[PDB]
RNA sequence: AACUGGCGAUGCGGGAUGAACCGAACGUAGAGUUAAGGUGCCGGAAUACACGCUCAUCAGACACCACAAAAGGUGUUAGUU
RNA sequence: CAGUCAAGCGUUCAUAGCGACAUUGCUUUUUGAUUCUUCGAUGUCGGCUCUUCCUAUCAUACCGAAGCAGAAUUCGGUAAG
RNA sequence: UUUGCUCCACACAAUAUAGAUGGAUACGAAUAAGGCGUCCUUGUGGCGUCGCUGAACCAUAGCAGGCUAGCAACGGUGCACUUGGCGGAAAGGCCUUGGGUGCUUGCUGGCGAAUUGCAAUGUCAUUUUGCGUGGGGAUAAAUCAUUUGUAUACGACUUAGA
């Protein structure tokens, strides 16, 4: 029989699974759609959440009853180093979608940087980028040929970059590296911009700008094992319930004669890949400027 | 099958009483001989009272075309049963022999009426030769003088399932 | 019944040129040029003396004998719009709001905004097609004139001024209100 | 200027429309359309070429592109003698459709040895064309 | 008969050169269908539109990642309906399918081969003239598929240039008739053509 | 010449069958340029071999060979009859068989 | 309940699948021929040959059998007065 | 629960909305009839909890109709998001 | 940690081929229309011609293709170098300048074939791997353990550590 009283469903059902992410640093899935009138810019910036504070500011809303008034709001505090430029990549279009034909790298890499692509990094020989450097020190003897090729195909250019680990304050000395995507003017001129700016730092201000509405791509605090009480919301069993209250009751009917995907269960909560948009650039605050 | 037009000529079983009955005689059209004579005396059956037992048939013979290469109009008045009722109508065919016009009504009732060979009665073919006594628009379309049309589209069937360059369908 | 040949004789008037590839009918004349896909109909066409082309189906249905005279009335219209032009004249029609319609040019499209319909503060704005030309008829009161070759065009954007002044949530036999199509005619009639 | 359109025509089944049977005892013969009995079937005569006088199919017939003048149902002997006069046979024997069907007949009835002498004689033929193209 | 036979299928019904090819597969034929966003489906675009719903809607219940996997693109459509007329549950089946491959547009293995066709599967000979039908690419954008835009640019560039080798080699044969045209009818052309060729 | 082949190429494409019942005794081949049972009575009689390959030699030959011969046409589609000394092994399914121009009757 | 034929007690070919339907009843094999049913592919066997009718934004597709009705439609076909 | 017909109701007006006398159906959610499965046992009422599905749609989206001037309503369509 | 590892070539040895036996031989679009030539007022044009199947086209003669000679024959073709490009959809293939060498059945010759005995696929194509040879080329990391706590039931995971 039907349900005595209908309610709404427990959890969002496009956030599934609820899985620990595949890593720490969450990846931009999709990036903002071409225009090749505007000049060639960096589409995204990394940066080290530090903490949350107030700030109170004249909010001017036509119409609300707090206009030009002061209010009082939580805000994020992002620490944002600027982002080292360590090669780039090109993806031609294909009819099974974007693959990446070359990736070219930087003449001299940063030590966090190589830091990341090691493991027991103290007990290693360093050897790293080491005949790709014996490959580079020439004009174009290795490298402008694989920048003519990202120019004459690869629709889609990224630049791969990576953060400074050393001058934001923890403890890793382990650099994150990251494709961020080149989003103006044509694929040469992406190119460009990225042969000037290897092995060149680039700052927050110069990709965000104030009062910008942009999206947070991180995955989220882990919380381990969870209930379904918590991991979902479920309304909680009466106290004199045998055998635990902090459950769901029936987790399916007789038939079909399985639970179901859509059914709340118990599991990992937290560590999830999350991108939340519409977040408003409060400021862009410099660090060398007390 | 092929139909064949058959005269049979039937008559009653002689009697004492009166010996020499009427005779009578059916056009038939039928796969054979042994259904041509079925066919006889089931209209027999239902025109006069006599039956197989009752009676003997003294001639079958197979009719020709008088000329079957030379294109005339046949009317046909049928009768049939649909799954309702019982209805007259009347056809006409455009054709070299009464038996072709008789199997090509057969199968124009199928596919028109569903109407199965039991379910049929053909009344009369009836072979016409003069214009403005053909009704049908469908055969009054192809007595027009001095008729010529094309064959567009034409398909070409193939004996190799693989083909290597695009088919024509010019005529 | 598959009739074994329909034919309609299409007249051609002595200013104009057709040329017909496969499916592809072109309409040349002093208005300009009008092309018609008709890769749709699959109909046959036979030009006979420069002034009459006859369009034909051989052993088509009902169906298709049909489709034969609908594509003779289009090559027709394509005729009609290349010597002589279609004008339909709109007129305003409102009880108590006045109707305010006007033409604005946003990146050269030639936009028709209907502003005041009811009285509500929506803009209603329809595009303007290729080839549609937009006057605001003086002498007569409340008037649009949409005039062009292509009455397939001309008519399309008359309808869609129609179906732009709709009304909604009211009696639509008491609120008469909106722009309707009164005449739809030839630009050069009377010549 | 001028009104242009492709003409479109082919091959009109009509009364002394010559048709080449491709389907049955003929299958290969030229005969005379001699009626139109329907859309799908017409009475055909074939007397020079050997078909015999008959209602067949349009599908059993492939439509050629000679026409001879005949009246409409005219007699075996009319068709003959019309035949004759407008040489339709030897009008179909120089195109090239009737001269690939004879080509297909002969190079089917070509013998081993025969095989072997087109392949001499191929050889021949290729190193003098292939000279002339260098040469030319 | 061939290793490999390539089949254009731009112009083909699906279901029928789905069962030409499986039954090809099966006796033991490699083939490679190209131009699968060009096959055709008889009937309007929305019948067969609402024939894919109907496939979308099922799915295995308590769990969807267990159902009918729909695939979206129009060589997996073909695919799909080829798998449905090979038992590919067996082994021969699974043999028969291995032997099968299916693309959008040309790629570079094939675009530089000759294609082939298969009449009894093709649309202008196989339809009625006048009976509606659909394209694949255009119902499998409807249904889902990411990447008729990409074919379509790809499809033009190989056209332009297979065009120019048209013409290049239009060019080299005329040049070759034209210089043997006194290499020819010589005596040797006479025997070969008293002799059938 | 380069070509050196002296016999007809044929598949085979499965075992005489019901819907589902087999028969692996006789087997049903496809010769290749064969498309009628009128064209296919050529073949009626002829020799058909399936050779195969395996890794052990046996006799001085790594390849063998299972012979058989044409008994009858099958269907209307050129597809004749073989029967073998051997079952033909059913992996053989659409492989290549080789039938041969004797017994001659030319 | 009546007559018969069956299943029970019986496999085999067909009806996808079924105790009863259809065909046909059974020793172990071989060749040929067929039944009922089928011959696009699964699947052995004609994408056979004919004449039509049908286009369905829930088509239809083979007896038992796995459903559909009254009433309607210038859809289209044939026909009567 | 839904149809067909149409004597009447609806100031006149069968069919806006209804609709008698009759008649055709669908459904298996709020009853029987039967006794095929289960009596070497399938845990029965209701509630609580939770998921999913159907549509014969209460609300919401967009529409058509009215005895729809507006307001509010009523009758229907696509629609179970 | 006596030649560990990668690339190229070939003294061999081994396991097998969903099945070599001359060639997967490339315009596109249309089909109630096209292809190829030619002419121009270069266009949806005029003219000619073709199709009606690939029964085509290429390649095909020589000990599974031998050894030697000649003749209008400087054209075909294999190998191996070099040269200029083109090809990113899965390019991994397609053209091209030039120097050597082999053959040429384009035409005419000389010699050999046997005996596998009257057929027996009568063994000639690879897909990998192993073991060696001779010519080059570069001399890492991961895991455990310790640590960490942006993580965690345990695994797994951010991290650090000469």
């Given at each position: ?86 090669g ?55 490298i ?9 195909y ?45 092995e ?34 479920t ?16 987790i ?18 937290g ?15 410099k660090?060398?400027?007390? | ?23 009578f ?5 039928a ?10 005396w ?5 025109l ?21 290469t ?58 016409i ?20 049309f ?8 193939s ?13 | 019944?598959?009739?074994i ?60 004998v049909?489709?034969?005279r ?6 027709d ?16 029609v ?17 936009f ?20 549609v ?44 209100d ?14 | ?24 005892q ?7 359309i ?7 079937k ?50 179909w ?26 392949m ?17 | ?48 539109k609402?024939?894919?719903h ?80 659909t ?43 034209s ?9 040797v ?9 | ?6 016999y ?31 064209d ?7 020799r ?9 030699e ?24 073989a ?12 492989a ?11």
């Open positions: 029989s039907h349900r005595k009283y209908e309610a709404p469903r427990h959890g969002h059902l496009g956030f599934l699974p609820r899985k620990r992410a595949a890593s720490i640093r969450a990846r931009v899935k999709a990036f903002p759609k071409d225009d090749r009138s505007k000049p060639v810019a960096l589409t995204s910036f990394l940066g080290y959440k530090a903490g949350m504070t107030t700030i109170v500011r004249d909010l001017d809303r036509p119409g609300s009853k707090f206009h030009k008034r002061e209010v009082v709001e939580a805000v994020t505090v992002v620490d944002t180093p600027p982002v080292v430029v360590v780039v990549v090109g993806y031609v279009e294909t009819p099974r979608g974007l693959r990446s034909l070359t990736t070219v790298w930087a003449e001299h890499l940063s030590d966090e940087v190589k830091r990341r692509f090691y493991k027991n990094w103290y007990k290693s020989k360093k050897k790293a980028f080491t005949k790709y450097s014996a490959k580079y020190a020439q004009d174009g003897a290795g402008e040929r694989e920048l003519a090729r990202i120019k004459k690869a629709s889609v250019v990224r630049v791969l970059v990576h953060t400074q680990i050393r001058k934001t304050p923890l403890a890793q000395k382990k650099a994150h590296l990251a494709e961020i995507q080149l989003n103006g003017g044509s694929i040469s001129e992406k190119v460009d911009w990225a042969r000037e700016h290897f060149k730092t680039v700052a927050v201000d110069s990709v965000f700008e104030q009062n910008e509405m942009i999206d947070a791509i991180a995955v989220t605090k882990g919380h381990g094992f969870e209930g379904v009480t918590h991991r979902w919301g309304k909680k069993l009466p106290r004199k319930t045998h055998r635990g209250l902090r459950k769901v009751a029936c399916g009917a007789w038939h079909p004669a399985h639970v179901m995907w859509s059914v709340a269960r118990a599991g990992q909560r560590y999830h890949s999350r991108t939340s948009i519409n977040h408003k650039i409060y400021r862009v605050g660090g060398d400027d007390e | 099958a092929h139909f064949k037009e058959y005269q049979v000529i039937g008559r009653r079983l002689p009697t004492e009483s009166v010996p020499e009955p009427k005779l005689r059916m056009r038939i059209f796969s054979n001989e042994v259904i041509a004579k079925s066919r006889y089931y209209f027999l059956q239902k006069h009272k006599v039956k197989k037992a009752s009676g003997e048939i003294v001639s079958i013979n197979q009719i020709n075309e008088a000329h079957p030379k294109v005339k109009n046949f009317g046909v008045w049928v009768r049939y049963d649909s799954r309702s009722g019982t209805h007259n109508m009347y056809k006409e065919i455009r054709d070299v022999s009464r038996v072709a016009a008789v199997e090509t009504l057969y199968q124009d009732m199928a596919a028109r009426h569903r109407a199965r060979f039991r379910s049929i009665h053909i009344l009369k073919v009836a072979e030769e003069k214009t403005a006594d053909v009704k049908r628009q469908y055969v009054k379309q192809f007595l027009t003088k001095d008729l010529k094309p064959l567009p589209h034409r398909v070409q069937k004996t190799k399932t693989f083909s290597y360059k695009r088919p024509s369908t010019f005529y | 019944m598959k009739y040949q329909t034919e309609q004789q299409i007249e051609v008037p002595e200013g104009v040129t057709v040329s017909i590839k496969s499916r592809i009918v072109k309409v040349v004349g002093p208005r300009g040029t009008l092309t018609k896909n008709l890769k749709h109909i699959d109909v046959t066409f036979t030009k006979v003396n420069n002034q009459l082309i006859k369009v034909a189906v051989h052993n088509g249905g009902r169906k298709h049909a489709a034969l609908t594509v003779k009335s289009l090559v219209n394509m005729i009609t719009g290349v010597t002589k032009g279609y004008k339909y004249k709109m007129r305003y409102y009880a108590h709001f006045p109707i305010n319609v006007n033409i604005v040019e946003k990146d050269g499209a030639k028709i905004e209907v502003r005041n319909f009811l009285g509500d503060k929506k803009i209603r704005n329809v595009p303007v097609r290729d080839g030309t937009i006057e605001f008829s003086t002498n007569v009161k409340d008037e649009i004139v949409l005039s062009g070759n292509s009455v397939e065009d001309v008519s399309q954007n008359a309808a869609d001024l129609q179906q732009i002044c709709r009304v909604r949530n009211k009696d639509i036999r008491k609120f008469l909106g722009i309707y199509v009164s005449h739809k005619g030839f630009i050069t009639e009377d010549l | 200027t001028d009104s242009i359109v492709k003409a479109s025509n082919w091959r009109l089944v009509e009364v002394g429309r010559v048709v080449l049977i491709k389907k049955g003929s299958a290969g013969k030229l005969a005379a001699v009626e139109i009995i329907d859309q799908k017409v009475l055909i005569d074939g007397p020079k070429a050997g078909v015999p006088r008959q209602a067949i199919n349009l599908g059993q017939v492939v439509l050629t592109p000679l026409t001879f003048a005949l009246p409409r149902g005219a007699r075996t002997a009319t068709v003959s003698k019309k035949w004759a006069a407008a040489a339709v046979c030897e009008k024997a120089a195109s090239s459709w009737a001269k690939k069907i004879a080509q297909r007949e002969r190079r089917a009835a070509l013998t081993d040895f025969e095989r072997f002498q087109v001499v004689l191929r050889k021949q033929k290729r190193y003098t064309v292939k000279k002339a193209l260098a040469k030319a | 008969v061939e290793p490999v036979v390539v089949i254009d299928g731009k112009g083909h019904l699906v279901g029928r050169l789905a069962s030409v090819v499986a039954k090809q597969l099966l006796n033991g034929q490699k083939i490679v269908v190209v131009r699968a966003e060009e096959l055709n489906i008889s009937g309007e675009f929305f019948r067969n609402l024939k894919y109907d496939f979308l809607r099922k799915a295995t219940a308590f769990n969807k990642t267990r159902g009918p996997f729909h695939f979206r693109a129009p060589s997996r459509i073909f695919y799909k309906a080829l798998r449905g007329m090979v038992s590919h549950k067996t082994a021969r089946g699974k043999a028969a399918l291995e032997r099968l491959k299916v693309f959008e547009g040309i790629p570079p293995p094939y675009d530089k081969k000759k294609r082939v066709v298969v009449p009894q599967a093709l649309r202008v000979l196989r339809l009625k003239p006048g009976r509606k039908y394209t694949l690419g255009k119902l499998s954008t409807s249904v889902g598929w990411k990447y008729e835009d990409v074919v379509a640019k790809l499809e033009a560039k190989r056209k332009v240039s297979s065009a120019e080798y048209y013409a290049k080699k239009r060019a080299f044969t005329k040049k070759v008739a210089a043997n045209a006194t290499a020819a009818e010589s005596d052309a006479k025997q070969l053509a008293a002799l059938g060729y | 010449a380069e070509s050196h082949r002296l007809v190429k044929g598949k085979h494409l499965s075992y005489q069958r019901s819907k589902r019942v087999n028969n692996p005794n006789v087997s049903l081949i496809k010769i290749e340029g064969v498309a009628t049972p009128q296919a009575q050529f073949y009626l009689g002829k058909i071999a399936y050779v195969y390959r395996a890794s052990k046996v006799r001085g030959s790594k390849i063998r060979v299972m012979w058989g011969k044409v008994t009858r046409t099958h269907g209307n589609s050129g597809v004749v009859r029967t073998f000394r051997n079952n033909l092994p059913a992996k053989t399914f659409g290549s068989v080789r039938i041969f121009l004797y017994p001659s009757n030319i």
